[PDB]
Ligand binder design. Structure first.
Ligand SMILES: [Mg+2]
Ligand SMILES: [Mg+2]
Ligand SMILES: [Mg+2]
Lengths: 177, 175, 104, 84, 136
RNA sequence: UCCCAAAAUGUAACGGAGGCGCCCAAAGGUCACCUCAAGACGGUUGGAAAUCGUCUGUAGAGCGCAAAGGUAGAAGGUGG
RNA sequence: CACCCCCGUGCCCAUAGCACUGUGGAACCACCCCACCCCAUGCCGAACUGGGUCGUGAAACACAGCAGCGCCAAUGAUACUCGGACCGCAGGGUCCCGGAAAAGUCGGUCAGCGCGGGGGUU
């Protein structure tokens, strides 16, 4: 259930593609997240639950309610009030859910075709903006509430985006060429 | 320029037409007090890209460049000066004037060419051969033609201290 | 981060205290259970675990605490004070403590 | 009643009695209890031997001589290099 | 002319120029030789005058904006507090200062662009040219 | 509470501005820990700001209210 | 203080900071590894923490170079002013006498000074 081809396919192939002075200095993956900035447009003391309950069975992790920065701008805004939802993943659970996506997640996506190329976190870090939650190996509409979405963050030691992509792809990732 | 005295007391001159400067480098920072008029007729030309003979009373010719002059308000009259003894292979950096030449294709056109930056300071000049001016094109310039430092030809060696893309001049429109 | 060490350290009064402080660098397995005298940038004792260890390091725990408590003896110190670091007074460090906090 | 503004805005009547400053200066044989500085925030920070009241006031716990120390501004201290 | 927003009132005192360079933005320039209070409306009085003499090029610099509110007698009384936030706005010029400095027009088409512009100022001014090389 | 007030304190005017007659079971005691504003690139209903992420970032934020002083080794932000 | 270097802790607390670059490894350090429970992240043993290699030095750190930026900063002349003595109707200003800036310039530095422990000079 992963990590060998992680190094192997990635790591080695990396020196066998690049030239790293170590295995330490090779782009890896720090953490995968699931931001759930729902509500606001939907102040459902009830809807908030859909997410967590959900996120947790598809990310196997109780998330936190990233309450409003207390920001109270012109439109609907106020103090520190439940707005979004954060769920960070690293190492295990990361790879454990991660794999789902590389395996089932995206592959099992209606209208799916691949994912955008163009550099993101010039930090050598990549970004993923998922939408409809209806494409999850867990997501059950015949057992949920309504239907929503979500955003995922790729945190990678990658110093450069060049080094990023590869890692990202070899490790499992589709590109719409 | 035959400056002679150099005491801390300028009485013996403040009345008597005589300016009061100081010059140095890092070595000697000798006290100074030259003639008003002389310097007055002097600095004019050479400005700050002009070195002249400094034979302080006693016969000890010296080489220096005009550093910073601080003249009187209420009276365009000048009062204090700074000379930076010329070096040999490097003085520091200097301040060089931007100059236009040849009628511009903007003047006649319908507008007037404006020199955004009058004098311009460039990194390293090279003592012994330091540009006491800097002619510049303008003709090509038309309806809003900006010319930056990274344009003006350079006097073999000198490097531009001023940001290149910086508008040294630009043809201004009518009204 | 650092904050933690400077808060802990700062909270520990210097010469208003009169007492002495014992440190510790146990984020490594190279603790240093150092003892310093307020004013003078002097160190009175110390009882690391640098002189070998036998194999233990997170285990040499109370060892170094013991190696220090009795250590001051050859100086003769009665009142001292714990200026731990980030090290949130757990077991590893509590070691040195209790160890010394009784061996003294 | 009527239909305007209770009181006329933009005034300028009254202010406050006010005090503060430095009660004891550099080299004054303070005493147990003497107050040495009325400040507001922590202009002068409690040095060595100088107890600091609740209003950032600054007093002397023991006796001795008053000492002033100011490192690059920001942080200043009043100490008590006692005589004896 | 007038400032865009602010506090409201002020005071009054004097000492000679402090930040009125010389050459900058132009080849010719006008300098005030007496401590005064330039009324914004006495600036317009210049600008406009100066304009007329010129047709285009607009190489006229007014480096003396009015940062200063003055006041007035509401009619007479005295029993009340400070007054007339809006009498007008003033810009304190001091000796040596530079209110004006055209550039581009003939030496002469410059010595008239001021002459007139000088006939409507509460003080005495003289024109100037170059050798002005302090900071740049 | 600022300015006037003339670098100690103090100082007037129907002089120039602004607040208070409260609030907090915890917004307190102590003990642990965290640390801001803001922009840039990249990201889902979003798309101006805002939720997440990655850099910069002595703080340009915060401090129940008015301002000043003060403060990140916290007086700022959480829990026992 | 025999020479060095390294780890902890000071004084000092930007002329001791930053950056760009290079040096260091298996003594030290750090990353790293696992981590059910001790104790723990309002979600994540990321950080706290418990038990430990290898591998690396890449990151972090330590060190050294360097000055493009920061930080420091003259002198000369000046602003101002105690005191003395004057001017202009007034705005304002001057003379003699001591004090004397601020900004800028010459130039300056990428510290210095301790205590203790460790490992080296095959
Ligand atoms: Mg005197
Ligand atoms: Mg006098
Ligand atoms: Mg004098």
């Amino acid at each position: 259930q992963l990590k060998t081809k992680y190094n192997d396919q990635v790591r080695p192939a990396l020196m066998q593609q690049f030239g790293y002075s170590s295995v330490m200095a090779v782009p890896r993956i720090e953490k995968i997240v699931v931001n759930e900035g729902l509500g606001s447009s939907k102040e459902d003391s009830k809807a908030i639950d859909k997410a967590a309950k959900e996120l947790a069975l598809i990310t196997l992790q109780k998330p936190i309610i990233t309450k409003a920065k207390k920001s109270i701008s012109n439109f609907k805004l106020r103090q520190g009030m439940p707005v979004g939802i954060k769920v960070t993943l690293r190492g295990e659970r990361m790879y454990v859910f991660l794999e789902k996506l590389i395996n089932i997640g995206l592959p099992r996506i209606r209208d799916f075709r691949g994912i955008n190329p163009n550099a993101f976190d010039g930090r050598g870090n990549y970004n993923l903006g998922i939408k409809e939650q209806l494409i999850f190996p867990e997501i059950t509409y015949d057992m949920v509430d309504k239907t929503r979405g979500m955003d995922i963050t790729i945190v990678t030691t990658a110093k450069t985006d060049e080094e990023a992509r590869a890692l990202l792809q070899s490790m499992g990732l589709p590109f719409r060429k | 320029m035959e400056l002679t005295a150099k005491p801390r007391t300028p009485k013996q001159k403040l009345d008597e037409s005589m300016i009061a400067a100081v010059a140095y480098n890092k070595e000697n920072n000798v006290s100074f007090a030259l003639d008003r008029k002389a310097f007055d007729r002097a600095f004019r030309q050479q400005s700050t890209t002009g070195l002249f003979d400094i034979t302080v009373e006693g016969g000890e010719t010296f080489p220096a460049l005009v550093k910073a002059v601080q003249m009187d308000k209420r009276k365009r009259a000048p009062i204090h000066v700074d000379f930076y003894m010329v070096t040999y292979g490097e003085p520091v950096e200097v301040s060089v004037p931007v100059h236009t030449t040849g009628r511009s294709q903007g003047e006649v056109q319908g507008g007037l060419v404006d020199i955004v930056v009058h004098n311009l300071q460039i990194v390293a000049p090279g003592p012994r051969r330091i540009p006491q001016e800097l002619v510049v094109d303008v003709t090509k310039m038309n309806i809003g033609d900006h010319i930056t430092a990274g344009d003006i030809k350079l006097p073999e060696g000198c490097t531009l201290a001023a940001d290149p893309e910086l508008t040294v001049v630009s043809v201004l429109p009518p009204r | 981060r650092r904050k933690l060490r400077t808060r802990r350290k700062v909270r520990t009064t210097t010469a208003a205290s009169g007492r002495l402080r014992l440190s510790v660098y146990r984020s490594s397995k190279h603790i240093y259970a150092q003892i310093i005298d307020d004013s003078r940038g002097q160190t009175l004792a110390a009882a690391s675990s640098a002189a070998l260890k036998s194999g233990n390091k997170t285990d040499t725990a109370a060892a170094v605490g013991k190696a220090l408590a009795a250590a001051a003896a050859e100086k003769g110190i009665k009142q001292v004070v714990f200026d731990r670091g980030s090290y949130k007074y757990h077991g590893r460090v509590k070691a040195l403590a209790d160890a010394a906090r009784e061996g003294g | 009643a009527h239909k305007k503004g209770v009181g006329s805005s933009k005034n300028g009547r009254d202010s406050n009695p006010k005090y503060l400053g430095v009660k004891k200066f550099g080299g004054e044989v303070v005493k147990a209890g003497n107050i040495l500085v009325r400040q507001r925030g922590t202009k002068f920070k409690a040095g060595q031997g100088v107890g600091m009241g609740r209003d950032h006031t600054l007093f002397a716990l023991s006796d001795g001589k008053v000492v002033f120390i100011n490192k690059g501004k920001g942080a200043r201290f009043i100490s008590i290099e006692a005589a004896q | 002319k007038r400032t865009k927003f602010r506090k409201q009132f002020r005071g009054r005192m004097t000492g000679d120029a402090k930040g009125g360079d010389y050459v900058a933005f132009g080849d010719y320039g006008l300098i005030a030789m007496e401590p005064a209070w330039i009324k914004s409306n006495q600036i317009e009085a210049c600008r406009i005058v100066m304009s007329r003499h010129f047709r285009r090029g607009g190489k006229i610099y007014i480096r003396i904006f009015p940062d200063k509110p003055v006041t007035k007698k509401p009619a007479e009384t005295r029993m009340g507090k400070g007054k007339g936030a809006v009498e007008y706005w003033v810009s304190v010029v001091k000796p040596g200062r530079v209110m004006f400095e055209v550039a581009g027009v003939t030496e002469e088409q410059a010595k008239e662009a001021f002459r007139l512009a000088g006939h409507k100022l509460p003080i005495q001014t003289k024109m100037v040219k170059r050798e002005v090389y302090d900071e740049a």
